[PDB]
Design a protein around this ligand. Sequence first.
Ligand SMILES: Nc1ccc2ccccc2n1
Length: 377
Amino acid sequence: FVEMVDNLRGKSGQGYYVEMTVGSPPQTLNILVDTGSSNFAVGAAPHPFLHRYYQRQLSSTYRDLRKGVYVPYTQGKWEGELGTDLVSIPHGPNVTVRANIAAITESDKFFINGSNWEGILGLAYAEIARPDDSLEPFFDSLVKQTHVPNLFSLQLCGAASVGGSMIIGGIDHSLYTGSLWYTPIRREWYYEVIIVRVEINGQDLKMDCKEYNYDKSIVDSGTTNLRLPKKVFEAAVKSIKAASSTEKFPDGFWLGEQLVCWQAGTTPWNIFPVISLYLMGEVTNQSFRITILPQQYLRPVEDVATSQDDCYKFAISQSSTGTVMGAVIMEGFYVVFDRARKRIGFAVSACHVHDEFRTAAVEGPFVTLDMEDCGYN
Ligand SMILES: Nc1ccc2ccccc2n1
C-alpha cells in the first residue's frame, strides 16, 4: 500500500484532492476527496478558474446517460450532464472501472479561484446521491467491478500546501500509532455516527447526549471545521471561553466573523483546552474517545493582504444539519472507513501536529449507558 502513501495534496481551507484519470485515452484531473457527498462530478467546460477539464469529445469510452443533474447547496450550485466512462486512480489500486461521471456544465460558488482541483469525488453512499439513489457512487462501482476490498482510509496531515494519503482497499499501519477504535456507521447515507459524551479539558458539558447528534453527526473530509449544533456550540464555546480566560478576545471571533492573532512565534497553546468526543463503541455500554489539541481547532489563515502576524481562525462553528467532523477532527487521526463492517475506525495519526506537552489521543474502553438514546429520530 506504500504506492498510495502521500497521494493527497491541497491548500489550507481548500480541501484535499487526489489525482484521477477519466476516459480513453486517460485525461488527468485533480479531484477533491469528499466523504460528505456521493457524486463523482467534474468540470467539463472551460471555466476560467479551472486548470483543466473533462473533454468528452476526446474519449472513445464515453457514454451519455441522456439525463441532467442539478445540485443546489447553501449559497451555491453545480449542474451537469450524466454519463459513464473509464476511471482510474494513478496512485491507487491498479484497476480501471466504469463509473458515473457528472459533467459540470454550469456552477456558482463551487470551484475556488486559485485552487488546483477540478472535480469532487463523493465517497458517501447512494442514499444521498443525486438526482436519486440509483446513481451508483464511484466507490460502489469500484468495489462491485474489482476485487478491491470494500474499505478505504484517510490520513489528512496538512502543513501553505497540505498533504495526506487515501489508501483504497486497506489499512497502512505506518500511518497510525497505537490502536484503532471503531464506532458504528448508524446508517449508510452519510458516514453517520453517534457522539455519546463531550468533554472540554476533562470536564464535560452534561448535555442530553441527544443534542450532540441533532439531527445528525457525520464524518466529512469536505468540511474544514468541527461544526456543532447551536446549543452544543454555545455550551462548548462557553466552556472554551471559560477555560481560556487567561486572555480576552472579541466575542465575534468565536462566531467566525473575525480573525484573531498573536505576534510571530508567540501563540499561547496551553491557554486552550483539549476537546474530547466520546463515540459509541462496538459493544453495548462501551465507548471510546477521541481528543484533539488546539492546533486542530485553531488553524492559521494562510495569507491576510492587510496583515503580517500569526493569525489563526477558530475552526469550531454552529450548524443546522448536525455535527460535522471535518479536517479539524480528521487531521488528528488516521480514519478508516470500514464499509464492509458498517463502522469507522479512529487511531492517533502518525502525522498530527503535536508539541512536547500534549498529544491527540484515541482511548478506551469506557462505560457509557444509554448510547442509543443519543441518536435522533
Ligand atoms: N462534504 C461536503 C460539504 C459541502 C458540500 C457542498 C457541495 C458539494 C459537496 C459538499 N460536500
